[PDB]
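Lecture 7, part 2: worked example. A protein chain together with protoporphyrin IX containing FE.
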Amino acid sequence: ATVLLEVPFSARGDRIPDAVAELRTREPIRKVRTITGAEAWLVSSYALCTQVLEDRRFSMKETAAAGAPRLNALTVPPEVVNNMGNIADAGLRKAVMKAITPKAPGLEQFLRDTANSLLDNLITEGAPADLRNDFADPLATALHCKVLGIPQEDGPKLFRSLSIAFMSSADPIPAAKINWDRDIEYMAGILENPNITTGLMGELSRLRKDPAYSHVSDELFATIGVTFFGAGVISTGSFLTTALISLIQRPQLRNLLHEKPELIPAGVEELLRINLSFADGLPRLATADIQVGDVLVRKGELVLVLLEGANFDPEHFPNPGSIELDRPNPTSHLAFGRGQHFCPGSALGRRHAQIGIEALLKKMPGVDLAVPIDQLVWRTRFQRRIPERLPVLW
Ligand code: HEM
Ligand SMILES: O=C1N[C@@H](Cc2ccc(O)c(I)c2)C(=O)N[C@H]1Cc1ccc(O)cc1
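Predicted complex, written out as structure tokens:
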């Protein structure tokens, strides 16, 4: 006798399990068991993943309802699952989105300068270097302090909340609440700090004192800072880290992008397509009975949208495991989601990776892993797939 198929399948972020392709072919929507013991529908084809993400009756907000089948325990207050809705309802969506584009004057130069400084320090210290803890994550942290308008020196403490905040746990996590409450208090103080006049927090601080926002809660303003720092830093740092592995594993591509840096945007788009950074399918709760392929999903059931199911689907991306810079549908992947909850930071995430890769290839054109790839330690029970250390030489 066999147990119901368990998710997630593998915490390894350097390769897709052969099992995903078999599953997509045989059962592109299939029942699975999550780490909480809940049942869920796992969707793994491009067509069905898109259908779910574009139908708001598959609700993000409702996943936080008491008594719902859960993918994992909440690590934030339940109302924060509706963060973007709360921002929109407060009239802040346009301002928040404008503050997190890569377009502010000086931002791209700051990114380049930071990347080059991190890499110079690694070169001075000598190989081996850890490209996650000493390059990709500090680059993400520094970027997000700049985008938020907060002091660079405050970045590391906020960053250290994230190894817990983005856990994928069967049970509530006491440390997540301690760190959340502290980080909210920090952002509330930022909003009261007259020196904070730039970036997202500088803009929110002004809007907070504008009559058109006088009934928006101080809690929401602080929440925007905590959430955009956390989501952005974990997502950009984790994506860049695993993208560097995929690049290092492809010397011909590394060399092509080093020789022709104008191809880096196309390369990053393919690295996004093949990225395994999200450790679990994206969760949604059905708010009606909805046909998805051969399954009638019932109201109240949990649906998990497997991004790599869509992104490696050969019916949409032929030769899906290959990085090809000339595809006709290159941004049509689901790395940033799709529909109501499409990533509001997509342009910034692209530029973070493009600048980080450009700087790395210029400074370390001979970059290579310093350990066999199987020696990387993949973090478990986390909402991203990342190697604990990424040891390289050059
Ligand atoms: C390459 C880096 C990134 C990747 C791969 C990525 C991926 C994603 C994905 C897949 C979603 C959709 C989640 C869902 O539908 O359930 C999402 C949402 C989100 N992302 Fe990004 N993201 C990245 C960068 C960023 C950055 C730089 C920020 C902010 C500075 C950010 C903030 C958010 C927020 C706040 C949401 C939630 C939107 C919502 O609930 O409606 N992300 N991201
Ligand atoms: O904006 C938010 N929208 C939703 C949806 C969401 C869930 C998980 C993700 O990875 C992403 I991207 C988005 C949420 O539930 N929360 C935030 C992100 C956040 C920020 C700080 C935290 O500590 C935890 C989660």
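Residues 1-394 form a domain with the Cytochrome p450 fold (CATH 1.10.630.10). The radius of gyration is 21 Å. Keep this in mind for problem set question 3.
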